[PDB]
mmCIF file of C-alpha atoms in Angstrom:
data_model
loop_
_atom_site.group_PDB
_atom_site.id
_atom_site.type_symbol
_atom_site.label_atom_id
_atom_site.label_comp_id
_atom_site.label_asym_id
_atom_site.label_seq_id
_atom_site.Cartn_x
_atom_site.Cartn_y
_atom_site.Cartn_z
ATOM 1 C CA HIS J 12 129.526 60.792 105.059
ATOM 2 C CA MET J 13 128.331 57.295 105.827
ATOM 3 C CA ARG J 14 127.040 55.307 108.716
ATOM 4 C CA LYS J 15 127.988 51.752 109.563
ATOM 5 C CA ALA J 16 125.665 48.892 108.616
ATOM 6 C CA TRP J 17 125.495 45.183 109.323
ATOM 7 C CA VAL J 18 123.467 42.315 107.917
ATOM 8 C CA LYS J 19 120.279 41.987 109.924
ATOM 9 C CA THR J 20 118.712 39.268 107.865
ATOM 10 C CA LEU J 21 118.666 37.490 104.477
ATOM 11 C CA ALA J 22 115.138 36.445 103.493
ATOM 12 C CA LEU J 23 113.417 35.037 100.423
ATOM 13 C CA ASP J 24 110.736 37.658 99.567
ATOM 14 C CA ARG J 25 107.331 36.119 100.208
ATOM 15 C CA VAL J 26 105.968 36.921 96.718
ATOM 16 C CA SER J 27 108.548 37.688 93.929
ATOM 17 C CA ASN J 28 110.483 34.887 95.605
ATOM 18 C CA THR J 29 114.022 36.074 95.112
ATOM 19 C CA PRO J 30 116.597 36.796 97.918
ATOM 20 C CA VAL J 31 116.562 40.092 99.778
ATOM 21 C CA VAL J 32 119.016 41.786 102.117
ATOM 22 C CA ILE J 33 118.125 43.832 105.152
ATOM 23 C CA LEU J 34 121.041 46.068 106.096
ATOM 24 C CA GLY J 35 120.626 47.392 109.570
ATOM 25 C CA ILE J 36 121.917 50.912 109.944
ATOM 26 C CA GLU J 37 123.882 50.841 113.217
ATOM 27 C CA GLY J 38 122.789 53.408 115.777
ATOM 28 C CA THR J 39 119.241 53.542 114.362
ATOM 29 C CA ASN J 40 115.988 51.641 114.093
ATOM 30 C CA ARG J 41 116.366 51.853 110.296
ATOM 31 C CA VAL J 42 116.936 49.086 107.724
ATOM 32 C CA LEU J 43 117.717 49.163 104.050
ATOM 33 C CA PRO J 44 116.475 46.296 101.861
ATOM 34 C CA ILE J 45 118.397 45.368 98.650
ATOM 35 C CA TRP J 46 117.000 42.750 96.236
ATOM 36 C CA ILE J 47 119.735 40.505 94.855
ATOM 37 C CA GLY J 48 119.858 37.562 92.446
ATOM 38 C CA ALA J 49 119.256 33.925 93.439
ATOM 39 C CA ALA J 50 122.894 32.767 93.143
ATOM 40 C CA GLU J 51 124.194 35.715 95.127
ATOM 41 C CA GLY J 52 121.645 34.765 97.827
ATOM 42 C CA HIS J 53 122.982 31.215 98.146
ATOM 43 C CA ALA J 54 126.630 32.529 98.222
ATOM 44 C CA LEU J 55 125.582 34.897 101.023
ATOM 45 C CA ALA J 56 123.676 32.383 103.070
ATOM 46 C CA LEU J 57 126.896 30.313 103.040
ATOM 47 C CA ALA J 58 128.984 33.263 104.219
ATOM 48 C CA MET J 59 126.484 34.128 106.941
ATOM 49 C CA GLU J 60 126.431 30.519 108.130
ATOM 50 C CA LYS J 61 130.256 30.918 108.249
ATOM 51 C CA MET J 62 130.401 27.677 106.419
ATOM 52 C CA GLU J 63 133.527 25.486 106.043
ATOM 53 C CA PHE J 64 133.850 23.927 102.595
ATOM 54 C CA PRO J 65 136.547 21.601 101.387
ATOM 55 C CA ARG J 66 136.840 23.621 98.111
ATOM 56 C CA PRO J 67 137.283 27.381 97.572
ATOM 57 C CA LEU J 68 134.164 29.025 96.152
ATOM 58 C CA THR J 69 134.293 32.060 93.950
ATOM 59 C CA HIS J 70 134.757 34.640 96.732
ATOM 60 C CA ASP J 71 137.284 32.405 98.486
ATOM 61 C CA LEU J 72 139.276 32.550 95.292
ATOM 62 C CA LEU J 73 139.002 36.312 95.229
ATOM 63 C CA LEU J 74 140.239 36.689 98.758
ATOM 64 C CA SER J 75 143.086 34.299 97.925
ATOM 65 C CA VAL J 76 144.118 36.583 95.125
ATOM 66 C CA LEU J 77 143.977 39.544 97.539
ATOM 67 C CA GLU J 78 145.925 37.577 100.091
ATOM 68 C CA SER J 79 148.455 36.375 97.537
ATOM 69 C CA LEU J 80 149.055 39.969 96.527
ATOM 70 C CA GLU J 81 149.566 41.060 100.176
ATOM 71 C CA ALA J 82 146.358 43.115 100.285
ATOM 72 C CA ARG J 83 143.004 42.772 102.005
ATOM 73 C CA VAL J 84 139.462 44.028 101.867
ATOM 74 C CA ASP J 85 139.120 47.192 103.998
ATOM 75 C CA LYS J 86 135.483 48.276 103.970
ATOM 76 C CA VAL J 87 132.545 48.226 101.710
ATOM 77 C CA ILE J 88 130.234 51.108 100.813
ATOM 78 C CA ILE J 89 126.836 50.907 99.228
ATOM 79 C CA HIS J 90 126.626 54.422 97.896
ATOM 80 C CA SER J 91 123.903 55.061 95.178
ATOM 81 C CA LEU J 92 120.521 53.982 93.757
ATOM 82 C CA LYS J 93 120.064 54.710 90.024
ATOM 83 C CA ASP J 94 116.796 53.450 88.490
ATOM 84 C CA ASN J 95 116.119 50.389 90.750
ATOM 85 C CA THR J 96 119.946 49.521 90.914
ATOM 86 C CA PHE J 97 122.338 49.722 93.844
ATOM 87 C CA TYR J 98 125.992 50.739 93.241
ATOM 88 C CA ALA J 99 128.665 49.698 95.714
ATOM 89 C CA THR J 100 132.382 50.369 96.121
ATOM 90 C CA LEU J 101 134.727 47.602 97.295
ATOM 91 C CA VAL J 102 137.711 49.311 98.967
ATOM 92 C CA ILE J 103 140.913 47.257 98.926
ATOM 93 C CA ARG J 104 143.910 48.125 101.149
ATOM 94 C CA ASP J 105 147.404 47.339 99.951
ATOM 95 C CA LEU J 106 149.257 45.812 102.903
ATOM 96 C CA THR J 107 152.536 46.722 101.097
ATOM 97 C CA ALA J 116 145.770 56.262 102.014
ATOM 98 C CA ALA J 117 147.081 53.275 100.013
ATOM 99 C CA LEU J 118 143.441 52.404 99.446
ATOM 100 C CA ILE J 119 141.813 51.452 96.154
ATOM 101 C CA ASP J 120 138.150 51.959 95.317
ATOM 102 C CA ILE J 121 136.922 49.143 93.036
ATOM 103 C CA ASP J 122 133.389 49.276 91.675
ATOM 104 C CA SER J 123 131.199 46.293 92.756
ATOM 105 C CA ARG J 124 127.630 44.942 93.021
ATOM 106 C CA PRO J 125 126.241 45.336 96.522
ATOM 107 C CA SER J 126 125.809 41.615 96.752
ATOM 108 C CA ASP J 127 129.506 40.977 96.087
ATOM 109 C CA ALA J 128 130.762 43.699 98.353
ATOM 110 C CA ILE J 129 128.413 42.488 101.061
ATOM 111 C CA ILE J 130 129.590 38.860 100.714
ATOM 112 C CA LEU J 131 133.294 39.753 100.973
ATOM 113 C CA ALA J 132 132.508 41.931 104.006
ATOM 114 C CA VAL J 133 130.864 39.035 105.697
ATOM 115 C CA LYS J 134 133.769 36.632 104.992
ATOM 116 C CA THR J 135 136.536 39.016 106.092
ATOM 117 C CA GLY J 136 134.575 40.690 108.915
ATOM 118 C CA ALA J 137 135.342 44.058 107.423
ATOM 119 C CA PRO J 138 132.865 46.906 108.024
ATOM 120 C CA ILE J 139 129.924 47.806 105.777
ATOM 121 C CA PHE J 140 129.002 51.480 105.337
ATOM 122 C CA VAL J 141 125.882 52.970 103.584
ATOM 123 C CA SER J 142 125.898 56.449 102.066
ATOM 124 C CA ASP J 143 123.987 59.003 104.198
ATOM 125 C CA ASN J 144 121.951 59.959 101.157
ATOM 126 C CA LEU J 145 120.771 56.339 100.755
ATOM 127 C CA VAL J 146 119.825 56.107 104.433
ATOM 128 C CA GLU J 147 117.697 59.266 104.162
ATOM 129 C CA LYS J 148 116.022 58.682 100.832
ATOM 130 C CA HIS J 149 115.800 54.890 100.720
ATOM 131 C CA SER J 150 115.956 53.294 104.210
ATOM 132 C CA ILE J 151 112.910 52.655 106.314
ATOM 133 C CA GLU J 152 112.124 52.735 110.020
ATOM 134 C CA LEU J 153 110.438 49.976 111.973
ATOM 135 C CA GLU J 154 108.085 50.321 114.911
ATOM 136 C CA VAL J 155 107.318 47.535 117.444
ATOM 137 C CA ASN J 156 104.862 45.482 115.289
ATOM 138 C CA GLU J 157 106.743 46.121 112.017
ATOM 139 C CA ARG J 158 109.943 44.216 113.008
ATOM 140 C CA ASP J 159 108.369 41.313 114.831
ATOM 141 C CA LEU J 160 106.512 40.554 111.529
ATOM 142 C CA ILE J 161 109.703 38.874 110.081
ATOM 143 C CA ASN J 162 111.318 36.519 112.747
ATOM 144 C CA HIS T 12 154.111 17.147 81.057
ATOM 145 C CA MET T 13 150.744 18.963 80.412
ATOM 146 C CA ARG T 14 148.613 19.642 77.269
ATOM 147 C CA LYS T 15 146.871 22.833 75.988
ATOM 148 C CA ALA T 16 143.104 22.732 76.146
ATOM 149 C CA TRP T 17 139.939 24.684 75.363
ATOM 150 C CA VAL T 18 136.217 24.853 75.967
ATOM 151 C CA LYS T 19 134.561 22.775 73.226
ATOM 152 C CA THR T 20 130.956 23.003 74.547
ATOM 153 C CA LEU T 21 128.891 23.690 77.666
ATOM 154 C CA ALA T 22 126.472 20.777 77.587
ATOM 155 C CA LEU T 23 123.684 19.754 79.928
ATOM 156 C CA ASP T 24 123.764 16.277 81.333
ATOM 157 C CA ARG T 25 120.096 15.712 80.922
ATOM 158 C CA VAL T 26 120.131 12.732 83.262
ATOM 159 C CA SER T 27 121.404 14.593 86.292
ATOM 160 C CA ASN T 28 120.133 17.882 84.790
ATOM 161 C CA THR T 29 123.637 19.366 85.258
ATOM 162 C CA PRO T 30 126.230 21.305 83.259
ATOM 163 C CA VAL T 31 129.344 19.610 81.945
ATOM 164 C CA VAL T 32 132.231 21.591 80.552
ATOM 165 C CA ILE T 33 133.732 19.600 77.646
ATOM 166 C CA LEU T 34 137.365 20.684 77.355
ATOM 167 C CA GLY T 35 139.043 19.983 74.027
ATOM 168 C CA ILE T 36 142.672 18.798 73.975
ATOM 169 C CA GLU T 37 144.909 20.519 71.420
ATOM 170 C CA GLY T 38 146.524 17.928 69.099
ATOM 171 C CA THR T 39 144.273 14.892 69.994
ATOM 172 C CA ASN T 40 140.834 13.310 69.263
ATOM 173 C CA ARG T 41 139.614 12.955 72.911
ATOM 174 C CA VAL T 42 137.975 15.371 75.355
ATOM 175 C CA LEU T 43 137.752 15.700 79.147
ATOM 176 C CA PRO T 44 134.339 16.241 80.790
ATOM 177 C CA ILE T 45 134.112 18.210 84.058
ATOM 178 C CA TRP T 46 130.855 18.470 85.951
ATOM 179 C CA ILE T 47 130.068 21.839 87.536
ATOM 180 C CA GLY T 48 127.014 23.178 89.320
ATOM 181 C CA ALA T 49 124.375 25.201 87.525
ATOM 182 C CA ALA T 50 125.259 28.570 89.064
ATOM 183 C CA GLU T 51 128.683 27.933 87.691
ATOM 184 C CA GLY T 52 127.626 26.759 84.233
ATOM 185 C CA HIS T 53 125.614 29.918 83.864
ATOM 186 C CA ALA T 54 128.621 31.957 84.845
ATOM 187 C CA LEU T 55 130.528 30.080 82.160
ATOM 188 C CA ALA T 56 127.825 30.382 79.503
ATOM 189 C CA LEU T 57 127.867 34.174 80.082
ATOM 190 C CA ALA T 58 131.611 34.298 79.471
ATOM 191 C CA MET T 59 131.533 32.029 76.478
ATOM 192 C CA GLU T 60 128.821 34.244 75.010
ATOM 193 C CA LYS T 61 131.412 36.910 75.760
ATOM 194 C CA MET T 62 129.119 39.833 76.356
ATOM 195 C CA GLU T 63 128.238 42.995 78.264
ATOM 196 C CA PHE T 64 126.283 43.687 81.417
ATOM 197 C CA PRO T 65 126.450 47.158 83.029
ATOM 198 C CA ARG T 66 127.401 45.694 86.389
ATOM 199 C CA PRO T 67 130.468 43.568 87.225
ATOM 200 C CA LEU T 68 129.709 39.949 88.029
ATOM 201 C CA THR T 69 131.770 38.156 90.547
ATOM 202 C CA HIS T 70 134.479 36.992 88.101
ATOM 203 C CA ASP T 71 134.536 40.466 86.585
ATOM 204 C CA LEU T 72 134.994 41.649 90.136
ATOM 205 C CA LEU T 73 137.967 39.367 90.680
ATOM 206 C CA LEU T 74 139.626 40.419 87.443
ATOM 207 C CA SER T 75 138.953 44.017 88.450
ATOM 208 C CA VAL T 76 140.866 43.311 91.632
ATOM 209 C CA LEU T 77 143.762 41.850 89.600
ATOM 210 C CA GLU T 78 143.815 44.959 87.407
ATOM 211 C CA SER T 79 144.199 47.233 90.356
ATOM 212 C CA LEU T 80 147.049 45.332 92.008
ATOM 213 C CA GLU T 81 149.086 45.322 88.819
ATOM 214 C CA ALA T 82 148.403 41.655 88.084
ATOM 215 C CA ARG T 83 146.704 39.360 85.596
ATOM 216 C CA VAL T 84 145.686 35.812 84.755
ATOM 217 C CA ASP T 85 148.628 34.088 83.038
ATOM 218 C CA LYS T 86 147.253 30.527 82.678
ATOM 219 C CA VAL T 87 145.147 27.791 84.289
ATOM 220 C CA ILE T 88 145.869 24.239 85.113
ATOM 221 C CA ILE T 89 143.698 21.307 86.002
ATOM 222 C CA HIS T 90 146.318 19.089 87.830
ATOM 223 C CA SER T 91 144.436 16.468 89.874
ATOM 224 C CA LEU T 92 141.370 14.304 90.616
ATOM 225 C CA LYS T 93 140.673 12.670 94.013
ATOM 226 C CA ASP T 94 137.022 11.469 94.651
ATOM 227 C CA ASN T 95 135.111 12.873 91.629
ATOM 228 C CA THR T 96 136.586 16.315 92.331
ATOM 229 C CA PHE T 97 138.898 18.159 90.041
ATOM 230 C CA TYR T 98 141.694 20.384 91.317
ATOM 231 C CA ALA T 99 142.897 23.464 89.469
ATOM 232 C CA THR T 100 145.492 26.144 89.747
ATOM 233 C CA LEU T 101 144.921 29.679 88.820
ATOM 234 C CA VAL T 102 148.388 30.995 87.966
ATOM 235 C CA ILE T 103 148.521 34.751 88.250
ATOM 236 C CA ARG T 104 151.365 36.849 86.955
ATOM 237 C CA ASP T 105 153.133 39.580 88.834
ATOM 238 C CA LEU T 106 152.929 42.502 86.391
ATOM 239 C CA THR T 107 155.505 44.282 88.602
ATOM 240 C CA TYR T 108 157.958 41.643 87.262
ATOM 241 C CA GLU T 114 160.236 36.435 86.479
ATOM 242 C CA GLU T 115 159.265 32.796 86.050
ATOM 243 C CA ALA T 116 159.632 32.620 89.868
ATOM 244 C CA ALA T 117 157.335 35.644 90.180
ATOM 245 C CA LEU T 118 154.274 33.529 89.370
ATOM 246 C CA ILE T 119 151.523 32.770 91.872
ATOM 247 C CA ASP T 120 149.983 29.306 92.341
ATOM 248 C CA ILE T 121 146.472 29.826 93.757
ATOM 249 C CA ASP T 122 144.326 26.760 94.417
ATOM 250 C CA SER T 123 140.985 26.935 92.657
ATOM 251 C CA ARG T 124 138.010 24.912 91.471
ATOM 252 C CA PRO T 125 137.901 24.038 87.742
ATOM 253 C CA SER T 126 134.652 26.072 87.402
ATOM 254 C CA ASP T 127 136.232 29.384 88.415
ATOM 255 C CA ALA T 128 139.491 28.581 86.693
ATOM 256 C CA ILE T 129 138.014 27.863 83.305
ATOM 257 C CA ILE T 130 135.628 30.817 83.652
ATOM 258 C CA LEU T 131 138.451 33.319 84.339
ATOM 259 C CA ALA T 132 140.484 31.930 81.371
ATOM 260 C CA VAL T 133 137.579 32.305 78.965
ATOM 261 C CA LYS T 134 137.089 35.847 80.120
ATOM 262 C CA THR T 135 140.750 36.781 79.631
ATOM 263 C CA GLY T 136 141.681 34.650 76.584
ATOM 264 C CA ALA T 137 144.291 32.789 78.660
ATOM 265 C CA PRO T 138 145.539 29.204 78.049
ATOM 266 C CA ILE T 139 143.943 26.299 79.819
ATOM 267 C CA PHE T 140 146.130 23.232 80.140
ATOM 268 C CA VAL T 141 145.549 19.734 81.549
ATOM 269 C CA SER T 142 147.951 17.381 83.276
ATOM 270 C CA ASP T 143 149.223 14.483 81.106
ATOM 271 C CA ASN T 144 148.006 12.344 84.074
ATOM 272 C CA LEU T 145 144.310 13.153 83.724
ATOM 273 C CA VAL T 146 144.214 12.961 79.943
ATOM 274 C CA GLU T 147 145.720 9.389 80.163
ATOM 275 C CA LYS T 148 143.059 7.926 82.509
ATOM 276 C CA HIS T 149 140.081 10.256 82.309
ATOM 277 C CA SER T 150 139.763 11.707 78.766
ATOM 278 C CA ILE T 151 137.411 9.958 76.260
ATOM 279 C CA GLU T 152 136.224 9.743 72.562
ATOM 280 C CA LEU T 153 133.281 11.326 70.604
#
């Protein structure tokens, strides 16, 4: 199935210089990096900072729509890598298995997860094929 | 009490280096300029260009959410302006069905306009704003 992940860290990559996401894979010393666009980075940094703004940003709007339709984000699954691209599923639950799988970028799914506090899962297959494991010196190198 | 509107151009404000949406006003000679940030003007440019990517962008995400909950964008209103900040209303329609079954979600003008462009749905502006804050070409 799928193992639970959280957001370890959101860096700017020290060469290519775009945002990157390190998903920690709960229960393990493994992390999965996903390279996202610049705007999605700034949106995420704001969600991570749990940042109060006097105007609803694009994911606030989305969650309003969910709210308004008595439904709520449930969980968020990053499930495939096809040719340098990461496919995620945003699973809505309809407050009125009443679940809906909606296709999503990982960056979006991961933002909404942060804002709601709803869990993030990563496909087993991803973890095996595409995650990496850190020693002592490896992890320290990024703090 | 409010006028139809549309997106005339997405200009740069080459002083402040920042996008302005220039909304036309159906049946008049004046337009209303709304400043938005660059991330947002790029979102809007992509919509105006009206084209494909393989992956759903955030606003495509949101619409994709609407689809699934039997719902859709009905219209979009820019009602107010306190301190250089414009205040919109995404009105969504309950596609489970009437006039009272409409939803008034508070939204920035950036995301409102963007979601109307994407859907082909009518933008309006409050009589109020047009009176004080519109302008000539």
